[PDB]
Design a binder for these strands. Structure first.
Ligand code: FES
Ligand SMILES: [K+]
Ligand SMILES: [K+]
Ligand SMILES: [K+]
Ligand SMILES: [K+]
Ligand SMILES: [K+]
Ligand SMILES: [K+]
Ligand SMILES: [K+]
Ligand SMILES: [K+]
Ligand SMILES: [K+]
Ligand SMILES: [K+]
Ligand SMILES: [K+]
Ligand SMILES: [K+]
Ligand SMILES: [K+]
Ligand SMILES: [K+]
Ligand SMILES: [K+]
Ligand SMILES: [K+]
Ligand SMILES: [Mg+2]
Ligand SMILES: [Mg+2]
Ligand SMILES: [Mg+2]
Ligand SMILES: [Mg+2]
Ligand SMILES: [Mg+2]
Ligand SMILES: [Mg+2]
Ligand SMILES: [Mg+2]
Ligand SMILES: [Mg+2]
Ligand SMILES: [Mg+2]
Ligand SMILES: [Mg+2]
Ligand SMILES: [Mg+2]
Ligand SMILES: [Mg+2]
Ligand SMILES: [Mg+2]
Ligand SMILES: [Mg+2]
Ligand SMILES: [Mg+2]
Ligand SMILES: [Mg+2]
Ligand SMILES: [Mg+2]
Ligand SMILES: [Mg+2]
Ligand SMILES: [Mg+2]
Ligand SMILES: [Mg+2]
Ligand SMILES: [Mg+2]
Ligand SMILES: [Mg+2]
Ligand SMILES: [Mg+2]
Ligand SMILES: [Mg+2]
Ligand SMILES: [Mg+2]
Ligand SMILES: [Mg+2]
Ligand SMILES: [Mg+2]
Ligand SMILES: [Mg+2]
Ligand SMILES: [Mg+2]
Ligand SMILES: [Mg+2]
Ligand SMILES: [Mg+2]
Ligand SMILES: [Mg+2]
Ligand SMILES: [Mg+2]
Ligand SMILES: [Mg+2]
Ligand SMILES: [Mg+2]
Ligand SMILES: [Mg+2]
Ligand SMILES: [Mg+2]
Ligand SMILES: [Mg+2]
Ligand SMILES: [Mg+2]
Ligand SMILES: [Mg+2]
Ligand SMILES: [Mg+2]
Ligand SMILES: [Mg+2]
Ligand SMILES: [Mg+2]
Ligand SMILES: [Mg+2]
Ligand SMILES: [Mg+2]
Ligand SMILES: [Mg+2]
Ligand SMILES: [Mg+2]
Lengths: 71, 168, 108, 86
RNA sequence: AAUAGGUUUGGUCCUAGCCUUUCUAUUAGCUCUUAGUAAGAUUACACAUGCAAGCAUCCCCGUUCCAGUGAGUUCACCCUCUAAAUCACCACGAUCAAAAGGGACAAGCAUCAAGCACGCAGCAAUGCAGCUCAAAACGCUUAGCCUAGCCACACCCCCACGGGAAACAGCAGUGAUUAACCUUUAGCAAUAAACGAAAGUUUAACUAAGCUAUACUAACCCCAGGGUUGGUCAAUUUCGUGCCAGCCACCGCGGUCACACGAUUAACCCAAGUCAAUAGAAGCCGGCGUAAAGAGUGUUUUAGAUCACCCCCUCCCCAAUAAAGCUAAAACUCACCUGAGUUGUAAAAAACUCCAGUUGACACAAAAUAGACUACGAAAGUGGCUUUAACAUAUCUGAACACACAAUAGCUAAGACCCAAACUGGGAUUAGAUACCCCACUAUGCUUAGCCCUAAACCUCAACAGUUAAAUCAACAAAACUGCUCGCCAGAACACUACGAGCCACAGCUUAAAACUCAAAGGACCUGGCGGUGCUUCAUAUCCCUCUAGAGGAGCCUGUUCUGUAAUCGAUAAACCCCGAUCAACCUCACCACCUCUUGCUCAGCCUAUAUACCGCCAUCUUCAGCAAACCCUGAUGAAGGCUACAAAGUAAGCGCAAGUACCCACGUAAAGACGUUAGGUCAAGGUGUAGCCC
RNA sequence: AGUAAACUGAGAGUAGAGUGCUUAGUUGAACAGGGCCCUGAAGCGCGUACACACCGCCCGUCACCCUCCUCAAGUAUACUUCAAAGG
């Protein structure tokens, strides 16, 4: 069999890797922004739980951790 | 072709060929059989060929199977009164098993004939209505009666358009 | 697939039929925005008369004007139907000749 | 299609070939003739005395299209259409 | 999808999508005679006006129904229990049927995978920590439904005390809006409902009419239209147009003979309709080596299977894995002696010159031969030596995610460093050379400790059990199948992508769509062409060298190209170029300028266009030996193919070669030289099709 | 091989006109072996995404255009949910 199907995928992958390399500083700023909104969306979900259960503040001694940071 | 061995089992014709219709007392039927052994061969064919036919005729009876729990195969029926009926099936063929349970817990041909007759009373031939429920929709379909105006226009004298015209 | 697998997956699910440019409607009312000509893709050669209309749904689309000669102008009302113009890529609507402001083709 | 058709039609077993192969009568049952048994072929050689074994359930492979049609589950706007006499 | 059909290619077969043919509904165009019947806002948007609930000796009863709509949407069904209601009144009853309890009950999306109190016990107090969920919980989106009918809603705030606010989703009617467009009729005579003891009364329910080809039925002296006519697919004459104008559902048509465009003629189909657009009807038991698909490996769970008892024949050893230790060959380095160069190769340059050769000492690197063996391990992987530990399971199947692994590259940290080596630098090549070639050196390859989790992780062939007979089988590949199970696939491309989610991953990995687009994409073959394609054998004035005389340099002759001129044409790579011409001062002559003639030397004329309409006569391979009717056979009766002489499917008329003939022989030279190739040359030898000119 | 080379004559066509063409004759050699990079051919093979057939097909950057989609700072608008509760 010829490799024409492979060649189409080969060029797709080459152009994608080159695009990512050319815009890696913009994508890094976008990724940072998404992880922040992701952390906020997670904090809202936990706050919805204790508010709907009748509590006015988080359980005593609870601190929502940052589960999406590199550290 | 249809998948599996003996695909005839997965046809409505085959499933309706069961002759075992349990009495109203039967509530549960457990089947204990062994996967191997020459003396449990009839019980394996019973599970393979007949259980679908029994369940089809008795949709509300619970049927539960159990494999290799005891040395010999047997059936056990649980009745609504709390009575339990044990049936030893070791050495018997699947046809002898079907004939046995039919005799002790199946409705006879007389009881089944009567039930079918009481159903025919629900579709009275003299009633008029939709084809789904009645033979004829309107009396105009009966020969000799005044036919439907959609097929045979009524005389001008039998129409209100000209009764009111003459009267008015 | 085996009988167990077919039972577990259930009956097949047709892909939800996609609505065309008319959004599943016989015709649509439109307002002419501008007229122009389009070149067909090879091996055809012509200057096919088209127009851009604002459909009653708020969407703007290009429509082919069939027949020899038309008098459509901006701000005129037209009725558009389905049917793609085979050699005009992207043109999927056709003006109805003889309805609203678009009159019938003049004989010869 | 042509080559396959001629292969199938040329490799069919007549009723006389079936009677000779099994040494039994080939009896035909017609619904328009009621329960009247119609013998269509008899073995030219001796006639067996032992009946053909009656398997309670045949292990024959079924065609889903035939089964689906017999159960009224076959729905097609193109089947059973009226056509000119052929 | 069917009794199927059209469309992928130069061609065949396979696979596959799209479309055609059938039957309905709505809308649009054009058209339209009658009668009967059925049915009849696009919009839960806003509504002018009229009417739609009364009855009856006052109390009551009714106005909670009917009629309407489809916004919302598992309150509709079965069982248990039990109100209200009917049976005048009680009915320990029947009928009917709420609330409550149990059960059952739509679609799509798992890129919605976890929900977050969703349980149980106890008389209570209170105790336990459970409950639902990949057999789909939780969630989002869509939708009235299972139609003698049912459910839901009744302007909105799910509800309606309250609030917003002032209500046709009752009938008729109107505004706005949509492709979507019925009368501001009559009567309570029939039936149904309300009320009354009753005669009765009321009712936009209903009944009888009005409007409308949406449908059905029937009919008509006069009165037919619409669409089609390249193929699929029933049916076109003459003109116009000339890739323009336009046309098609698909394939396609139109570039001067257009059955495909427009007009016209005729024909075909249906017919008071026709059929353009839209929508619906019509679809899982087929597959996964190469077309989409066996997802890198193994284990188990809940389960499934019958391959588990019977009933049996490959235990141990060879290159599994981990740890520790070890070293034969070859390097590196150092030292002595010797040489003056060493390195690089198609050939150079650069590089080194504490360089090279012999000898000796000398690894945190890598493991000739054995191996023509075919073993070990789940796979990845594993082939120097020794030792220790050590290679799961007495049924099978069982996961992208659980659990544990997983070449190379790569990341983090600390070490080792012979050699190799991305990058980088230098040298060379080249139009350029960010390459291929040469040199140098780094990350890296090694060890240790952690990560990363990918592969053409492919023997592209899932595990287990069984068969070699039948139909052996599209093609190729590695013969064809059966049982059972899990995984996966459903035109191409978008896309190893976007988004979401998870992850020690931050230019990453895993999972993985849609819109716009096309009518194909794809798999395997056949023939031809081509190959800076292999082997073998060749060219006899012949491809190269060899032999002889020349051309290419000078002058002249002559052709051609350019330039010039008011001033022909044709040939114009081999196969044009002293060629058509065995021939131009006028003539020839077809050219240019000027002047003249018009039934004209001709029952006219044209050297006008088209050699890509042609005959005629030729160039070219050919300094060839092949061409081929009619048959036969092979390939499963596919495109196609057809020979072996100790012969295995080919037989072949005819044509060409050959043979004969001419010239001085039988030699040589002429002549001859098929079918085809270059739409090769010639419309200007002559003739001529088509088109054009005719003071 | 009576070839190449050299030399000489005649003819066709014109009224005349060629260093051209056609043709007769005279003198009269050298070498002839080896080889396959190049041109081309034959036999047997291999490959092929070309078939308008290698003067083929074909890939990407950039420019120029219509269609669709995604990301995205700040801001605005609309919608959903709450009482399925507590005193
Ligand atoms: S259906 Fe009976 S009168 Fe019309
Ligand atoms: K064209
Ligand atoms: K097809
Ligand atoms: K009253
Ligand atoms: K109603
Ligand atoms: K609704
Ligand atoms: K409501
Ligand atoms: K009445
Ligand atoms: K119409
Ligand atoms: K070794
Ligand atoms: K892989
Ligand atoms: K492989
Ligand atoms: K070839
Ligand atoms: K010719
Ligand atoms: K000529
Ligand atoms: K001519
Ligand atoms: K380009
Ligand atoms: Mg290959
Ligand atoms: Mg691409
Ligand atoms: Mg087309
Ligand atoms: Mg073709
Ligand atoms: Mg609606
Ligand atoms: Mg009561
Ligand atoms: Mg209830
Ligand atoms: Mg899943
Ligand atoms: Mg997503
Ligand atoms: Mg749900
Ligand atoms: Mg709705
Ligand atoms: Mg309203
Ligand atoms: Mg309300
Ligand atoms: Mg109204
Ligand atoms: Mg309508
Ligand atoms: Mg009235
Ligand atoms: Mg009416
Ligand atoms: Mg014409
Ligand atoms: Mg026409
Ligand atoms: Mg594949
Ligand atoms: Mg070796
Ligand atoms: Mg397992
Ligand atoms: Mg899975
Ligand atoms: Mg994986
Ligand atoms: Mg790894
Ligand atoms: Mg490493
Ligand atoms: Mg080195
Ligand atoms: Mg290094
Ligand atoms: Mg090592
Ligand atoms: Mg491998
Ligand atoms: Mg498996
Ligand atoms: Mg696809
Ligand atoms: Mg990848
Ligand atoms: Mg990705
Ligand atoms: Mg992402
Ligand atoms: Mg010269
Ligand atoms: Mg010239
Ligand atoms: Mg010329
Ligand atoms: Mg020419
Ligand atoms: Mg003159
Ligand atoms: Mg002259
Ligand atoms: Mg002239
Ligand atoms: Mg020619
Ligand atoms: Mg001779
Ligand atoms: Mg000759
Ligand atoms: Mg000859
Ligand atoms: Mg030519």
């Amino acid at each position: 069999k010829n490799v024409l199907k492979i060649r189409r995928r080969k060029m797709n992958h080459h152009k994608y890797r080159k695009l990512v390399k050319k815009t890696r500083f913009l994508r890094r700023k976008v990724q940072e922004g998404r992880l922040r909104r992701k952390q906020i969306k997670f904090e809202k979900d936990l706050r919805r739980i204790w508010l709907k259960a009748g509590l006015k503040e988080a359980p005593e001694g609870w601190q929502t951790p940052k589960i999406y940071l590199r550290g | 072709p249809m998948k599996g061995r003996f695909p005839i089992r997965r046809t409505l014709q085959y499933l309706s060929q069961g002759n075992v219709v349990f009495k109203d007392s039967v509530k549960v039927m457990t089947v204990n059989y062994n996967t191997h052994g020459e003396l449990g061969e009839g019980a394996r064919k019973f599970v393979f060929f007949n259980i679908p036919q029994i369940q089809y005729k008795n949709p509300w009876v619970q049927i539960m199977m159990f494999k290799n729990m005891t040395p010999s195969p047997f059936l056990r029926f649980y009745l609504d009164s709390g009575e339990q009926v044990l049936v030893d099936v070791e050495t018997k063929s699947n046809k002898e098993i079907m004939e046995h349970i039919r005799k002790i817990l199946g409705k006879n041909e007389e009881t089944l004939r009567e039930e079918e007759e009481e159903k025919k009373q629900l579709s009275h031939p003299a009633n008029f209505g939709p084809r789904k429920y009645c033979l004829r929709e309107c009396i105009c379909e009966v020969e000799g009666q005044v036919p439907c105006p959609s097929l045979v226009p009524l005389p001008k004298e039998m129409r209100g358009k000209y009764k009111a015209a003459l009267k008015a | 697939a085996t009988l167990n697998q077919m039972h577990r997956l259930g009956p097949p699910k047709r892909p939800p039929r996609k609505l065309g440019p008319t959004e599943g409607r016989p015709q649509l009312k439109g307002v002419v925005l501008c007229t122009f000509t389009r070149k067909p893709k090879k091996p055809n050669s012509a200057n096919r008369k088209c127009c851009r209309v604002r459909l009653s749904t708020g969407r703007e689309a290009v429509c082919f004007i069939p027949g020899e000669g038309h008098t459509l102008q901006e701000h005129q009302i037209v009725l558009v139907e389905g049917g793609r113009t085979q050699d005009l890529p992207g043109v999927k609507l056709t003006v109805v000749r003889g309805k609203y402001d678009c009159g019938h083709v003049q004989k010869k | 299609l042509t080559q396959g058709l001629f292969r199938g039609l040329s490799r069919q077993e007549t009723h006389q070939q079936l009677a000779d192969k099994k040494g039994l009568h080939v009896v035909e049952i017609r619904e328009e003739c009621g329960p009247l048994p119609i013998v269509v072929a008899s073995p030219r050689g001796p006639l067996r005395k032992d009946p053909e074994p009656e398997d309670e359930v045949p292990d024959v492979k079924l065609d889903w299209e035939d089964v689906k049609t017999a159960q009224g589950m076959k729905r097609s706007v193109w089947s059973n259409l009226k056509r000119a006499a052929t």
